[PDB]
Copies of this chain bind each other. A is one copy, B any other.
Amino acid sequence: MSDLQQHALNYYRQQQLPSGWADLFGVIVNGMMDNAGEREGLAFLRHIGGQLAERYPLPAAVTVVDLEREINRVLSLFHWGCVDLRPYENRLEIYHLALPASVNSSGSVRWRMAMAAVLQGLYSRWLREQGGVESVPLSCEETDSESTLLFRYQ
């Protein structure tokens, strides 16, 4: 690590979100969470994520590396970071890297929670349709770095 690495990464993260639409989403989620509460907001955002997932159909793949390549292909259009797949004996581990940065210094955690909920719904629908098990959800998890999220599929 060094100062130059910090400057480069900070500049890259700053150039990640486009003005106008992202701020509108931030205000919408802030207002809705202020109005209706936390649990209801999370459930609603998960439902919205599922509905958004329904619009984009992934082609039927056969191997996991096909899944990572296709998910990266779809996510590169939205500028929504990168994804890594790690298989295990009975688990699937989802690493999400380079999350869109927060837009307000006083509402970073709210934004992160909202984005995590939307992505959780998206991944849940995508994995359910491709041939997974419909009785198991995706568990969310924090990691030390701010710009990364962990997901577990059991």
A residues near B, CB below 8 A? 1, 4, 7-9, 11-12, 15, 18-25, 27-28, 31-32, 35, 44, 47-48, 51-52, 55, 76-82, 84, 95, 97-98, 118, 145, 147-148
Contacts and interface: CB of A to CB of B under 8 A. Distances in A.
Determine chain A's interface SS by DSSP, over half rule.
helix
Given A28-B48, A52-B27, A82 B21 contact: no
Contact of A97 (B4, B22, B148): B4
Given A11-B98, A19-B78, 8 more contacts: A4-B145, A11-B81, A12-B98, A20-B79, A21-B25, A24-B52, A28-B28, A31-B48
25 contacts: A4-B84, A4-B97, A4-B148, A7-B82, A7-B84, A7-B97, A8-B9, A8-B98, A8-B147, A11-B81, A12-B12, A12-B98, A15-B79, A20-B79, A21-B21, A21-B25, A23-B55, A24-B48, A27-B48, A27-B51, A27-B52, A27-B55, A28-B28, A31-B47, A35-B44
